[PDB]
Write a protein that holds these residues in place. Structure first.
Motif, PDB file in Angstrom:
ATOM      1  N   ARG A  75       3.172 -17.868 -25.122  1.00  9.52           N
ATOM      2  CA  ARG A  75       3.936 -16.750 -25.663  1.00  9.52           C
ATOM      3  C   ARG A  75       3.046 -15.536 -25.902  1.00  9.52           C
ATOM      4  N   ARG A  76       1.760 -15.752 -26.190  1.00  9.94           N
ATOM      5  CA  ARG A  76       0.826 -14.634 -26.272  1.00  9.94           C
ATOM      6  C   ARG A  76       0.562 -14.050 -24.891  1.00  9.94           C
ATOM      7  N   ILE A  77       0.519 -14.896 -23.861  1.00 11.44           N
ATOM      8  CA  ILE A  77       0.407 -14.387 -22.497  1.00 11.44           C
ATOM      9  C   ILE A  77       1.581 -13.467 -22.190  1.00 11.44           C
ATOM     10  N   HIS A  78       2.795 -13.936 -22.475  1.00 13.68           N
ATOM     11  CA  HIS A  78       3.968 -13.124 -22.180  1.00 13.68           C
ATOM     12  C   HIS A  78       3.944 -11.816 -22.952  1.00 13.68           C
ATOM     13  N   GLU A  79       3.494 -11.855 -24.210  1.00 10.49           N
ATOM     14  CA  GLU A  79       3.421 -10.628 -24.994  1.00 10.49           C
ATOM     15  C   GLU A  79       2.478  -9.623 -24.346  1.00 10.49           C
ATOM     16  N   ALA A  80       1.319 -10.088 -23.875  1.00  7.04           N
ATOM     17  CA  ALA A  80       0.378  -9.187 -23.219  1.00  7.04           C
ATOM     18  C   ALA A  80       1.029  -8.485 -22.035  1.00  7.04           C
ATOM     19  N   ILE A  81       1.860  -9.205 -21.280  1.00  9.32           N
ATOM     20  CA  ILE A  81       2.484  -8.623 -20.097  1.00  9.32           C
ATOM     21  C   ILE A  81       3.535  -7.592 -20.495  1.00  9.32           C
TER      22      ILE A  81
END
Ligand code: MG
Length: 418
Positions: free
Chosen positions: A120-126
């Motif tokens: 979910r942190r990966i998705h937030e970065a995107i």
């Protein structure tokens, strides 16, 4: 009462090994993927695609360093549909820690939270990084898997269509043998040689339940089979193929699929993977793949197949919290006559990712989650497995300590009537 969560506190555990060595590898690959896409981002968005690519990489590099150095989790920030629900869960998870436990962090908190937080942190970065906020950092990998399995896809699609021709002429035991064969292909992704690695087999319960719905189905009434999906490429093909047989055999009248709202655990199927793959099969230039693909889009057009997206599947929550956190989803699941859950992460969420002893019953490990008759079709990639005979798991640990984390073993483990 419920046991402790698997976590990186036990330095001898797979969860530790995974958080220590494997999650950093995943993030590095993702950063590499964005790096390698620089030229594509420029052609499509100009200089600002490249600035956004660099912005995302920095954030993912910050995320990696938090993991490497066991920093406490921080709240989610960018506006998104599940941002507040996530932050509520983080707060709740901190509330579970006593003074001596400190703050929620990578090597202390539940392994399930740790991994779901990371993606979910990966998705937030995107999504923080327009104009590439659409990017699926795992799409290249998921498309590769499809292209690398053309022969098996061709073979499975061919087998299915050969079967469909004759299906009307099959004896109920002949149909059951076809059904077990497709369940086995759905599990493994030759079957006689893999049969010794099925340590729990409730396929007979699946047959009894469905064939009785079929025999006792009075006209205009439905048999609903739900499939909670796991991976894309060939593993999704095996699930589409099974769903087709379910309808063609009249063991089901409707199949409902559930995927992930966002890129998840690398290879897990989102709505875009589901649609993309069916498109590639339909517009294949191979005779039996194309016919399968046409049938499947036709199924979707008629409501015989339905794809569902729901946020709950990409929350960190255990499935025991669904009645309270996603009541509409639980209510929908209660309309199923049988729910098939694919894969390891679904099993962990169904059992809380806890340190159950081997002999605990599956029903009890489910901790209240009984929407409908359900069965988990799973290869073991995690140090958790309930419902075993006494001494069975103990014997496997003594003989091969790695047995339940290599994906070598599989189960059909059913909860429901009979
Ligand atoms: Mg405290």
């Amino acid at each position: 009462v419920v046991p402790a969560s698997l976590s990186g506190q036990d330095v001898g555990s797979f969860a530790y090994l995974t958080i220590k060595d494997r999650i950093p590898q995943i993030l590095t690959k993702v950063i590499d993927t964005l790096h390698r896409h620089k030229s594509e981002f420029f052609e499509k968005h100009g200089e600002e695609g490249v600035e956004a690519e660099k912005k995302a990489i920095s954030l993912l590099s910050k995320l990696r360093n938090e993991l490497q150095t066991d920093k406490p989790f921080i709240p989610l920030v960018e506006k998104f549909v599940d941002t507040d629900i996530w932050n509520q869960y983080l707060e709740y998870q901190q509330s579970l820690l006593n003074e001596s436990d400190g703050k929620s962090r990578w090597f202390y908190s539940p392994w399930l939270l740790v991994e779901c937080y990371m993606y979910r942190r990966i998705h937030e970065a995107i999504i923080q990084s327009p104009p590439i906020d659409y990017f699926d950092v795992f799409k290249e990998s998921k498309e590769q898997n499809f292209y690398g399995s053309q022969e098996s896809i061709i073979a499975l699609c061919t087998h299915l269509q050969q079967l469909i021709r004759t299906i009307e002429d099959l004896d109920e035991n002949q149909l059951k043998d076809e059904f077990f064969k497709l369940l086995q292909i759905s599990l493994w992704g030759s079957l006689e040689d893999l049969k010794p690695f099925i340590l729990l087999n409730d396929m007979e319960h699946l047959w009894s339940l469905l064939s009785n719905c079929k025999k006792t189905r009075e006209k205009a009434s439905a048999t609903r089979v739900y499939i909670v999906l796991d991976n894309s490429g060939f593993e999704l093909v095996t699930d589409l193929i099974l769903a087709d047989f379910l309808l063609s055999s009249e063991l089901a009248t409707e199949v409902h699929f559930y995927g992930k709202t966002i890129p998840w655990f690398v290879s897990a199927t989102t709505i875009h993977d589901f649609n993309w793959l069916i498109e590639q099969v339909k517009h294949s230039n191979h005779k039996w793949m194309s016919k399968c693909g046409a049938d499947w889009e036709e199924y979707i057009k008629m409501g015989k197949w339905v794809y569902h997206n729901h946020i709950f599947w990409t929350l960190p929550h255990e499935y025991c919290a669904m009645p309270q956190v996603a009541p509409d989803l639980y209510a929908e699941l209660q309309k199923a006559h049988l729910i098939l859950f694919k894969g390891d992460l679904n099993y962990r969420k169904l059992t809380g990712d806890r340190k159950w002893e081997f002999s605990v019953p599956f029903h009890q490990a489910l901790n209240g989650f009984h929407p409908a008759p359900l069965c988990t079709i799973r290869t073991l990639k995690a140090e958790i497995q309930v419902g075993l005979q006494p001494g069975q798991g103990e014997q496997l640990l003594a003989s091969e300590p790695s047995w339940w984390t290599t994906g070598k073993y599989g189960i059909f483990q059913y909860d429901g009537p009979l």
